[PDB]
Design an enzyme around this catalytic site. Structure first.
Site, PDB file in Angstrom:
ATOM      1  CG  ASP A 183      35.028 -38.437 -11.729  1.00 33.45           C
ATOM      2  OD1 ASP A 183      35.847 -39.414 -11.533  1.00 33.45           O
ATOM      3  OD2 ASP A 183      33.986 -38.420 -10.737  1.00 33.45           O
TER       4      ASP A 183
ATOM      5  CG  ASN B  66      35.342 -43.776 -12.251  1.00 32.18           C
ATOM      6  OD1 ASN B  66      35.294 -44.994 -12.610  1.00 32.18           O
ATOM      7  ND2 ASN B  66      35.246 -43.754 -10.885  1.00 32.18           N
TER       8      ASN B  66
ATOM      9  CG  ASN C 254      33.930 -43.299  -7.410  1.00 33.92           C
ATOM     10  OD1 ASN C 254      35.025 -42.757  -7.356  1.00 33.92           O
ATOM     11  ND2 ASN C 254      33.028 -43.060  -8.476  1.00 33.92           N
TER      12      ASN C 254
ATOM     13  CD  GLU D 207      30.422 -52.864  -9.721  1.00 30.05           C
ATOM     14  OE1 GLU D 207      31.507 -52.291 -10.385  1.00 30.05           O
ATOM     15  OE2 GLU D 207      29.341 -52.383 -10.113  1.00 30.05           O
TER      16      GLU D 207
ATOM     17  CB  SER E 136      36.866 -40.786  -8.770  1.00 30.36           C
ATOM     18  OG  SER E 136      35.993 -41.090  -9.813  1.00 30.36           O
TER      19      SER E 136
ATOM     20  CG  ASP F 255      34.934 -47.135  -9.308  1.00 22.58           C
ATOM     21  OD1 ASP F 255      34.801 -46.227  -8.857  1.00 22.58           O
ATOM     22  OD2 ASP F 255      34.213 -47.761 -10.284  1.00 22.58           O
TER      23      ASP F 255
END
Ligand SMILES: [Cl-]
Length: 129
Positions: A48, A46, A59, A35, A50, A52
């Site tokens: 959309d 991301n 998220n 990750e 958002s 991380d």
């Protein structure tokens, strides 16, 4: 902070992640490796809108507040910046909520695609725990 493999394993063990909800320590170290490459300061946007955050790439759509993900939730009740600290406590506490929520570690795409079904104990081999 960029953790070493065994350094992070021992930190996660102290914070109670070994066998938490049945996931051995190697699963958590493997997920952190793919990750974030063990870097507490990692961020990724991301599609959309958002973002991380942190060593486990938590998220902002559901778990933390970053002030720029409209209509999102803050289920861990923390600012997302708290997840970038060199102290992993906040990330671990929030991860425990995520993994308890029904889908287990499948919430982490890298874990599903790169750790699940592999010899995860190799991630803790050689470490003094
Ligand atoms: Cl992946």
């Amino acid at each position: 902070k960029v953790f070493g493999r065994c350094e992070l394993a021992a930190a996660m063990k102290r914070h109670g992640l070994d066998n938490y909800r049945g996931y051995s320590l190697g699963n958590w170290v493997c997920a952190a490796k793919f990750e974030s490459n063990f870097n507490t300061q990692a961020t990724n946007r991301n599609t959309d809108g958002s973002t991380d955050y942190g060593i486990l790439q938590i998220n902002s759509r559901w778990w933390c507040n970053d002030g720029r993900t409209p209509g999102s939730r803050n289920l861990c009740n923390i600012p997302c910046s708290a997840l970038l600290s060199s102290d992993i406590t906040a990330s671990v506490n929030c991860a425990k909520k995520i993994v308890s929520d029904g889908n287990g570690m499948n919430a982490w795409v890298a874990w599903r695609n790169r750790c699940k079904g592999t010899d995860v104990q190799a991630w803790i081999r050689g470490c003094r725990l």
